[PDB]
Design a protein around this motif. Structure first.
Motif, PDB file in Angstrom:
ATOM      1  N   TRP A  56      12.086  13.548  -2.030  1.00 37.83           N
ATOM      2  CA  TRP A  56      12.896  12.390  -1.690  1.00 37.83           C
ATOM      3  C   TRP A  56      13.188  11.449  -2.850  1.00 37.83           C
ATOM      4  O   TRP A  56      14.018  10.547  -2.688  1.00 37.83           O
ATOM      5  CB  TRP A  56      12.235  11.586  -0.557  1.00 37.83           C
TER       6      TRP A  56
ATOM      7  N   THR B  50       8.158  17.113   1.126  1.00 40.16           N
ATOM      8  CA  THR B  50       9.526  16.627   1.043  1.00 40.16           C
ATOM      9  C   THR B  50       9.836  16.135  -0.365  1.00 40.16           C
ATOM     10  O   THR B  50       8.981  15.575  -1.055  1.00 40.16           O
ATOM     11  CB  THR B  50       9.759  15.502   2.050  1.00 40.16           C
TER      12      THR B  50
ATOM     13  N   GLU C 172      17.072  -0.956  -2.988  1.00 38.23           N
ATOM     14  CA  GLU C 172      16.451  -0.217  -4.081  1.00 38.23           C
ATOM     15  C   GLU C 172      17.447   0.632  -4.858  1.00 38.23           C
ATOM     16  O   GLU C 172      17.033   1.437  -5.700  1.00 38.23           O
ATOM     17  CB  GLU C 172      15.327   0.675  -3.547  1.00 38.23           C
TER      18      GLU C 172
ATOM     19  N   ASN D 191       5.365   4.399  -7.996  1.00 36.93           N
ATOM     20  CA  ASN D 191       6.159   4.603  -6.791  1.00 36.93           C
ATOM     21  C   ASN D 191       7.608   4.806  -7.220  1.00 36.93           C
ATOM     22  O   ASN D 191       7.897   5.127  -8.377  1.00 36.93           O
ATOM     23  CB  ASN D 191       5.971   3.433  -5.812  1.00 36.93           C
ATOM     24  N   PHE D 192       8.535   4.635  -6.273  1.00 40.68           N
ATOM     25  CA  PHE D 192       9.947   4.879  -6.546  1.00 40.68           C
ATOM     26  C   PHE D 192      10.492   3.990  -7.656  1.00 40.68           C
ATOM     27  O   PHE D 192      11.572   4.276  -8.182  1.00 40.68           O
ATOM     28  CB  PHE D 192      10.768   4.677  -5.270  1.00 40.68           C
TER      29      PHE D 192
ATOM     30  N   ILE E 169       8.169  -0.193   1.897  1.00 42.19           N
ATOM     31  CA  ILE E 169       6.991   0.053   2.722  1.00 42.19           C
ATOM     32  C   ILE E 169       5.955  -1.053   2.550  1.00 42.19           C
ATOM     33  O   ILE E 169       5.254  -1.402   3.505  1.00 42.19           O
ATOM     34  CB  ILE E 169       6.395   1.441   2.414  1.00 42.19           C
TER      35      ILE E 169
ATOM     36  N   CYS F   8      10.138   6.722   7.066  1.00 45.03           N
ATOM     37  CA  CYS F   8       8.836   6.134   6.767  1.00 45.03           C
ATOM     38  C   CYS F   8       8.954   4.652   6.455  1.00 45.03           C
ATOM     39  O   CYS F   8       8.175   3.832   6.954  1.00 45.03           O
ATOM     40  CB  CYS F   8       8.190   6.855   5.584  1.00 45.03           C
TER      41      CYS F   8
ATOM     42  N   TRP G  13       4.399  -4.063  -6.368  1.00 44.29           N
ATOM     43  CA  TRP G  13       5.723  -3.891  -5.762  1.00 44.29           C
ATOM     44  C   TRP G  13       6.796  -4.681  -6.513  1.00 44.29           C
ATOM     45  O   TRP G  13       7.553  -5.453  -5.925  1.00 44.29           O
ATOM     46  CB  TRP G  13       5.706  -4.261  -4.276  1.00 44.29           C
TER      47      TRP G  13
ATOM     48  N   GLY H 229      13.202  13.223   3.283  1.00 42.16           N
ATOM     49  CA  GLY H 229      11.851  12.738   3.456  1.00 42.16           C
ATOM     50  C   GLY H 229      11.455  12.765   4.918  1.00 42.16           C
ATOM     51  O   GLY H 229      12.270  13.045   5.799  1.00 42.16           O
ATOM     52  N   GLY H 230      10.181  12.469   5.162  1.00 45.65           N
ATOM     53  CA  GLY H 230       9.685  12.418   6.521  1.00 45.65           C
ATOM     54  C   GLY H 230       8.375  13.140   6.751  1.00 45.65           C
ATOM     55  O   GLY H 230       7.963  13.328   7.899  1.00 45.65           O
ATOM     56  N   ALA H 231       7.706  13.555   5.672  1.00 45.24           N
ATOM     57  CA  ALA H 231       6.391  14.169   5.819  1.00 45.24           C
ATOM     58  C   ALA H 231       5.351  13.177   6.323  1.00 45.24           C
ATOM     59  O   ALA H 231       4.288  13.598   6.791  1.00 45.24           O
ATOM     60  CB  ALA H 231       5.936  14.778   4.494  1.00 45.24           C
ATOM     61  N   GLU H 232       5.632  11.875   6.233  1.00 48.51           N
ATOM     62  CA  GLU H 232       4.752  10.882   6.839  1.00 48.51           C
ATOM     63  C   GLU H 232       4.714  11.032   8.355  1.00 48.51           C
ATOM     64  O   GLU H 232       3.693  10.731   8.984  1.00 48.51           O
ATOM     65  CB  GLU H 232       5.202   9.473   6.444  1.00 48.51           C
TER      66      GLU H 232
ATOM     67  N   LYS I  10       1.825   9.497  -8.224  1.00 46.79           N
ATOM     68  CA  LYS I  10       1.046   8.511  -7.482  1.00 46.79           C
ATOM     69  C   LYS I  10      -0.441   8.585  -7.799  1.00 46.79           C
ATOM     70  O   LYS I  10      -1.141   7.570  -7.709  1.00 46.79           O
ATOM     71  CB  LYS I  10       1.260   8.702  -5.981  1.00 46.79           C
TER      72      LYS I  10
ATOM     73  N   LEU J  48       0.006   4.175  -1.527  1.00 42.26           N
ATOM     74  CA  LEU J  48       1.179   3.777  -2.290  1.00 42.26           C
ATOM     75  C   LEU J  48       1.109   4.209  -3.748  1.00 42.26           C
ATOM     76  O   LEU J  48       2.114   4.099  -4.458  1.00 42.26           O
ATOM     77  CB  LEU J  48       1.371   2.259  -2.211  1.00 42.26           C
TER      78      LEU J  48
ATOM     79  N   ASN K 282       3.903  14.875  -0.592  1.00 47.15           N
ATOM     80  CA  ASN K 282       2.582  15.087  -0.029  1.00 47.15           C
ATOM     81  C   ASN K 282       2.644  16.047   1.157  1.00 47.15           C
ATOM     82  O   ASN K 282       3.715  16.470   1.599  1.00 47.15           O
ATOM     83  CB  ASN K 282       1.970  13.758   0.402  1.00 47.15           C
TER      84      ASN K 282
END
Ligand SMILES: COC1=C(OC)C(=O)C(C/C=C(\C)CC/C=C(\C)CC/C=C(\C)CC/C=C(\C)CC/C=C(\C)CC/C=C(\C)CC/C=C(\C)CC/C=C(\C)CC/C=C(\C)CCC=C(C)C)=C(C)C1=O
Ligand code: HEC
Ligand code: HEC
Ligand code: HEC
Ligand code: HEC
Ligand SMILES: O=C(O)c1cc(C(=O)O)c2c(n1)C(=O)C(=O)c1cc(C(=O)O)[nH]c1-2
Ligand SMILES: [Ca+2]
Lengths: 723, 433, 108
Positions: free
Chosen positions: A245, A243, A61, A397-398, A554, A107, A489, A178-181, A335, A393, A263
């Motif tokens: 990210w 986070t 990405e 998205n990104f 993801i 994630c 996607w 990141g990592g709030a998931e 989102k 999603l 989130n």
């Protein structure tokens, strides 16, 4: 040198026309290039100029940077390659050797979205949480720092990974994580671009006890954000989330730094904050002072977020005639499905309207901008299942969105993937090395059995699963035109001055369209799906358009059997570049993917149900829902590990493949639960082996369109008022 | 037509594995300069690029045929038996013509000077080499043998004894360092294992179950040759780069014919190196080793990947119980693969690219010798001999990991992906340790 | 305006009458009013924490849709639904949260 930053600022006003010095080619992140060598009447003659095969087998990405003829591209596993931007020959390469035991703490794939350039150095973040500066010419290490403080609260669970692209403002590298998931405390740190010393830090959520963290966010967190966070909940232990990210914007016009806050953690509003409070600086845009890191203003797009509606999406700055007067504004497409125009200077809300279908709000409040929630959308408060569009999603998205001042249009790659939200039974239960979203993992996911309920659910999900590209008109707040696709996607957008927009599709095609009416002009098969945004630049005076190709993220990791509706694809990661007189060709590759293998016939029925449950909470995030892989990671149905109890435990419980991303799961699951997972996988393989073999039996050797559920006949672009 | 001829010549060159041993490590293709060990000294691969001065640019078709079939250079001297000209003497005229076209047009001319062999002058004379060919290399009819009724078996035999040269590694050598059998009519010595070449041992390709392909199926052979990963074996050592550089590019028909010919060979007497597992080794490893040094080393370093019963994981970790490579009489390749690991890319049927770590630095010589003895005498294995620390220390000095670079060139498959570091607190030993 | 168009005006009947709102709906209304201000953090929080505990508005395992219907601008009274996201003046949004506090005073 040239005092980098001055060059990046001039890139917004026609300076440095053949360079890509920042993540969005400029501080405005418009991703618009003034090169008109390739235009509408000419792009149809584009040919592949060169290619370079990457040494990774996961999603790509990254957004490559191009500095005066050298392309710095970051790949999967946080590897960096500097190539010749004209001929695609590897000038040098560097890999930070990311440890394999933290791969499950991220994630969504071990991706790297970009890098930054400053004063003859290239800066990038590693997946394990390291910021590294290298010499732009030799490629030697200048400095390396760990961005996660050992002290401070950060919650009990600290699942921190770095995959976004750093941005540099006035000689300060800004990076989030990141990592709030899984559960983490979001923050953004600014380090010195020359020596690597930490300049400042800004925490996006208050610490559990309202105590100073010693950072630059102390006053605003202890005075404004803390009272909005319940009284006692799971946010004190998990971290609270928020986070940053994806988006990190620097505006030299207003001299501010915009952070897109993610989130909450857990997603469950009732679990996180008793279902009370706004949870300030969560799912919001926060503008701070680039020098001292002090808070300036904020705007909360999604108060009391419970659907994973991050405001981390791309933030762009434009100049628009607001109220018949020119004004510097911020445009955002997060989102939640709303396009937001706000004031860049004061942060005042200007307007906001849904650019896609959303059922969680009846528009926004014209006087505040706060969403008009429908009561049933707050599934956490109602305690009833909710079919949310957009899903986790989101509608965006990104994937990058572009802007064209010639057409005054914002090109957004939008998607529609609904999700069923329902609370986790028995209350919140955080798991080590698992997604602690706080929702029911049995309700999510689809089945392939003959149950009429399951058949209807799958049919509806396939009905309302879509992907497209919308040319939003901010002045009218209406879509100018749309380009439909088979599925979601797809890659990001790039806009040039030749009235041509470039985008990579999820079926493996690189496409160039007219920027005024969206007519298809150029198409090229890239042998693998493209999820990275294309860039364009100049080398030796001639214009090139380059993009990284690779299937990952993801969506293929999670959705599995329904992740190939856009067409069959496997991961063949590389970097390709097209020129007006290219004479290259992609060599053939094997597109069979992971073929089925006959499994053992013995399994236990009594361990099915709970086994399935366990697979949905620990393994579904990477190996696909219902034990069906999306084409990037191995399919567990045909794996040789589930053939025996001991081998399966030594692979899952002990993490025998930790060097490649399979980490141990004995820190959260007993051996009996792992055996239950093994029995479930064996049963699924026995169920689906004959069907998969029959599907792959044809001339091409890959499953047909009917098996992949690709949509025959075009589907309507959702828009508002209907999915 | 010329492009088709060039492509056919390229296919034949890949079929004969010319590029593997005619390229130095990190060198230009077909530019030579590779060090080949010999009992007399060290030889260097000649560059075969179409360069008119260094390479074979001045070679005609007749010179090419003479060099391939009889081992005679354009000078007129005889090449060393390092050239598989005893096997290349079976190459058909069409194959030689196609390879000549490919080498004169499809190869980029490099200008590297051929390194002279570092052999003392009395033993460096080239005249005796022709006498070696006269004494030990009989005349062979070029092309498919006109005696095998089955066309597929005939094609497989031509591949095995022609372009591909398996007997160069898999056939024992006699007193004159020549293969004791050039075909299945030679006797039971044909493709019956070999001496360690580069510290790697090619086992028997015959029908004996303990060490040969008796328990191998035809599809097993085809898949192993194509990708190197089946459910009961995994390629390594010299075979690894034989598969990576040559065999993975073979057509499905050629691989199927080779497997058919291998399975159709005359029966050979069974060995006594494999027995029946009664669970004594499995019970010992379940207990914890209980004083067995080899069992303790296996439990603390190897049991995580290869299981306590030595069966491993299908298509991921090859078994050690009944594995012919662990079963062979000479344990040199066993200790070599223990000391140096091995990286294998993912395949269609064997996903999740795998990596043996090299235990040359994690374990001492005594520990690796003990683990080798334990695996040679475990789970019913009956391999003879014992390994001392001296042999391990000899192998750790003379030995290196495989290149794993042929997996990443001109291949439709996946790249050989290097493994990430495990971490700061990683250990292969169980939690009880 | 006639700039990039603003969000359309919301639909509903605003009101500050809180006769029969019933508990866990006033708790939701005070959740809506503690955030976004219009009352306070010191005189609205005691109502929210004490109206949602005595009458079990959240319960961490239970539903009570009446909490969500009130976390938004909606509240029912005498068989009629009133919307608080109306009252575009934002000065009628205040003295409506104050009215809700007054109505919740005998409830606690
Ligand atoms: C008196 O006789 C003698 C001669 O004859 C007059 C001889 O010339 C020689 C020389 C003969 C030999 C060196 C024996 C030949 C044996 C082979 C060619 C088989 C072993 C070689 C291989 C197949 C391995 C080569 C593969 C490589 C290095 C490529 C892989 C690289 C990555 C000897 C010893 C001799 O005794
Ligand atoms: C994302 C971090 C993952 C999660 C969560 C799980 N797995 Fe996984 N697994 C992952 C990768 C990247 C790989 C490939 C390893 C490599 O060498 O490339 C794997 C592999 C496996 C395998 C091996 C399959 C085979 O080689 O045929 C198995 C059996 C497996 N994974 C099982 C498994 C289970 C049971 C999980 C739930 C607990 C699980 N994985 C989660 C990545 C990730
Ligand atoms: C490794 C075992 C080899 C394989 C497979 C092939 N060749 Fe080779 N070749 C090899 C050596 C070590 C030598 C030199 C020996 C010596 O006496 O110095 C050679 C020599 C040649 C030559 C002669 C060139 C010259 O010395 O001027 C030619 C033309 C040649 N080899 C060609 C060739 C072809 C076409 C092959 C595929 C069929 C091939 N070789 C395989 C080592 C090895
Ligand atoms: C020397 C370089 C070799 C040549 C030429 C060929 N083979 Fe080989 N082979 C070699 C080794 C050192 C080994 C050891 C085991 C391994 O997997 O590392 C092998 C093994 C095989 C096997 C597997 C046997 C087993 O697992 O019991 C097969 C089927 C095999 N080799 C086939 C084969 C064929 C068909 C060849 C001609 C093209 C051939 N080998 C040449 C070394 C060498
Ligand atoms: C997981 C990382 C492993 C550990 C720990 C050990 N082995 Fe292994 N081994 C592993 C793989 C993936 C492979 C395949 C070969 C390749 O080329 O990568 C192997 C191979 C062997 C072999 C060769 C047999 C064959 O390839 O069929 C042997 C003899 C072997 N392994 C033994 C061995 C021992 C004694 C170990 C403890 C020190 C050990 N292995 C650890 C994976 C892993
Ligand atoms: O809450 C979080 O911390 C978090 C992090 C990330 C991430 O780091 O990429 C994603 C998400 N959430 C998320 O919800 C999501 O849909 C998502 C997609 C991706 C991606 O890379 O494609 N990351 C993330
Ligand atoms: Ca999220």
């Amino acid at each position: 040198q040239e005092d980098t930053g001055t060059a990046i600022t001039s890139s917004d006003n026609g300076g440095h026309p053949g360079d890509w010095l920042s993540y969005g080619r400029s501080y405005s992140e418009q991703r618009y290039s003034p090169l008109d060598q390739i235009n509408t009447e000419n792009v149809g003659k584009l040919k592949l100029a060169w290619h370079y095969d990457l040494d990774t087998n996961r999603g790509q990405e990254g957004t490559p940077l191009i500095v005066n003829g050298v392309m710095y591209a970051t790949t999967n596993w946080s590897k960096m390659k500097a190539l010749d931007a004209a001929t695609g020959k590897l000038l040098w390469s560097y890999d930070p050797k990311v440890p394999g035991n933290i791969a499950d703490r991220g994630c969504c794939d071990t991706v790297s979205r970009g890098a930054a350039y400053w004063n003859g150095k290239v800066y990038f973040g590693t997946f394990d949480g390291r910021l590294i500066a290298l010499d732009a010419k030799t490629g030697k290490l200048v400095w390396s720092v760990y961005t996660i403080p050992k002290e401070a609260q950060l919650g009990h669970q600290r699942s921190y990974t770095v995959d976004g692209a750093p941005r540099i403002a006035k000689g300060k590298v800004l990076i989030g994580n990141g990592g709030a998931e899984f559960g983490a405390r979001g923050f953004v740190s600014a380090f010195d671009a020359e020596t690597g010393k930490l300049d400042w830090r800004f925490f996006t959520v208050p610490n559990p006890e309202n105590k100073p963290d010693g950072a630059a966010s102390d006053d605003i967190l202890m005075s404004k954000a803390y009272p909005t966070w319940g009284k006692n909940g799971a946010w004190k232990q998990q971290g609270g989330g928020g986070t940053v990210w994806d988006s990190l914007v620097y505006d030299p016009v207003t001299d501010l730094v915009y952070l897109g806050v993610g989130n909450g953690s857990p997603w469950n509003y009732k679990f996180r904050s008793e279902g009370k409070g706004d949870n300030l600086f969560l799912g919001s845009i926060v503008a701070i002072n680039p020098d001292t890191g002090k808070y300036v203003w904020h705007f909360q797009e999604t108060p009391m977020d419970e659907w994973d509606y991050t405001s981390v999406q791309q933030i762009m700055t434009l100049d628009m005639p607001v109220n018949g007067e020119m004004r510097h504004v911020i445009v955002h497409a997060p989102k939640n499905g709303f396009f937001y125009i706000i004031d860049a200077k004061t942060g005042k809300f200007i307007t906001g309207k849904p650019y896609t279908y959303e059922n969680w709000a009846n528009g926004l409040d014209p006087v505040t901008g706060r969403p008009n929630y429908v009561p049933d959308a707050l599934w956490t408060l109602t305690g009833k299942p909710w079919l949310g569009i957009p899903g986790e999603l989101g509608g965006h998205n990104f994937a990058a969105m572009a802007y064209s001042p010639k057409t005054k249009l914002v090109y957004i790659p939008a998607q529609q993937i609904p999700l069923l939200y329902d609370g986790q039974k028995g209350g919140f239960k955080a798991y080590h090395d698992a997604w602690n979203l706080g929702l029911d993992m049995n309700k999510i996911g689809l089945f392939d059995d003959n149950d009429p309920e399951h058949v209807a659910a799958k049919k509806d999900f396939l009905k309302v699963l879509k992907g497209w590209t919308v040319a939003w008109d901010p002045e009218k707040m209406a879509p100018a035109f749309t380009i439909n696709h088979k599925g979601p996607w797809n890659g990001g957008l790039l806009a040039t001055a030749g009235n041509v927009i470039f985008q990579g599709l999820a079926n493996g095609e690189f496409h160039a369209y007219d920027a005024t009416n969206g007519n298809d002009l150029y198409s090229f098969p890239a042998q693998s799906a493209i999820i990275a945004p294309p860039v364009t630049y100049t080398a030796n005076g001639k214009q090139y358009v380059a993009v990284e190709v690779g299937w990952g993220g993801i969506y293929p990791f999670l959705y599995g059997g329904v992740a190939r509706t856009s067409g069959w694809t496997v991961n063949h990661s590389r970097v390709i570049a097209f020129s007006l007189d290219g004479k290259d060709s992609l060599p053939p590759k094997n597109e069979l993917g992971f073929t089925p293998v006959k499994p053992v016939p013995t399994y236990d029925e009594a361990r099915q149900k709970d086994g399935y449950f366990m697979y949905q909470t620990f393994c579904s995030a990477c190996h696909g829902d219902n034990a069906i892989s999306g084409g990037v990671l191995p399919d567990l149905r045909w794996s040789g590990a589930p053939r025996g109890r001991e081998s399966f435990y030594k692979l899952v419980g002990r993490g025998a493949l930790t060097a490649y991303g399979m980490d141990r799961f004995d820190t959260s699951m007993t051996p009996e639960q792992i055996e239950d997972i093994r029995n479930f996988i064996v049963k699924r393989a026995n169920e689906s082996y004959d069907d998969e073999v029959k599907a792959r039996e044809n001339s091409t050797g890959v499953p047909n369109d009917q098996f992949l559920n690709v949509p025959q006949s075009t589907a309507d672009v959702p828009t508002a008022d209907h999915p | 037509a010329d492009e088709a001829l060039i492509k056919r010549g390229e296919y034949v060159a890949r079929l004969s594995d010319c590029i593997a041993c005619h390229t130095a490590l990190h060198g230009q293709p077909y530019a030579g300069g590779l060090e080949i060990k010999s009992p007399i000294g060290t030889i260097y691969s000649t560059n075969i690029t179409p360069d008119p001065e260094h390479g074979i640019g001045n070679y005609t078709l007749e010179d090419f045929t003479k060099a391939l079939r009889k081992g005679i250079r354009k000078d007129g001297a005889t090449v060393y038996p390092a050239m598989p000209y005893p096997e290349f003497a079976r190459l058909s005229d069409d194959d030689i013509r196609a390879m000549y076209a490919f080498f004169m047009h499809g190869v980029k001319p490099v200008a590297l000077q051929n390194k002279a062999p570092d052999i003392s002058w009395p033993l460096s004379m080239r005249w005796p080499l022709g006498m070696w060919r006269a004494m030990f290399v009989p005349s062979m009819t070029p092309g498919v043998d006109k005696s095998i009724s089955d066309p597929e078996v005939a094609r497989g035999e031509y591949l095995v004894n022609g372009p591909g040269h398996c007997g160069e590694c898999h056939t024992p050598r006699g007193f004159g360092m020549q293969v004791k059998a050039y075909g299945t009519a030679g006797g039971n010595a044909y493709l019956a294992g070999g001496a360690p070449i580069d510290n790697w041992i090619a086992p028997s390709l015959r029908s004996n179950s303990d060490t040969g392909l008796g328990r191998w199926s035809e599809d097993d052979i085809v898949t192993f040759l194509k990708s190197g990963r089946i459910d009961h074996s995994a390629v390594f050592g010299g075979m690894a780069d034989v598969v990576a550089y040559s065999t993975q590019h073979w057509s499905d028909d050629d691989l199927r014919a080779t497997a058919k010919y291998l399975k159709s060979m005359p029966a050979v007497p069974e060995g006594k190196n494999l027995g029946q597992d009664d669970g004594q080794t499995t019970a010992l490893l379940n207990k914890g080793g209980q004083g067995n040094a080899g069992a303790e080393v296996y439990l603390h370093n190897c049991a995580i990947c290869h299981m306590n019963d030595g069966t491993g994981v299908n298509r991921m970790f090859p078994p050690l119980a009944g594995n012919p490579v662990v079963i062979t009489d000479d344990p040199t390749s066993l200790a070599n693969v223990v000391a140096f690991g091995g990286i294998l890319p993912p395949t269609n049927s064997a996903p999740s690219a795998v990596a043996m770590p090299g235990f040359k630095n994690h374990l001492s010589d005594q520990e690796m010798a003990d683990v080798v003895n334990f695996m040679r005498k475990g789970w019913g294995n009956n391999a003879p001999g014992t390994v001392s620390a001296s042999d391990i220390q000899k192998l750790r000095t003379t030995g290196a990991p495989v290149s794993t670079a042929g997996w990443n060139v001109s291949s439709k498959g996946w790249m050989a992906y290097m493994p990430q570091p495990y971490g700061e607190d990683w250990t292969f030993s169980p939690q009880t340790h | 305006e006639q700039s990039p168009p603003p969000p359309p005006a919301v639909q509903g009947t605003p009101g500050k009458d809180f006769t029969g709102v019933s508990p866990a709906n006033l708790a939701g209304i005070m959740n809506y009013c503690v955030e976004q201000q219009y009352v306070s953090y010191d005189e609205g929080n005691p109502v929210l924490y004490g109206l949602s505990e005595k009458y079990k508005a959240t319960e961490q395992t239970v539903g009570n849709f009446d909490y969500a219907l009130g976390t938004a601008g909606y509240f029912d009274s005498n068989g009629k639904r009133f919307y608080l996201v109306a009252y575009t003046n934002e000065d009628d949004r205040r003295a409506a949260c104050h009215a809700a506090v007054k109505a919740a005073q005998p409830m606690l």
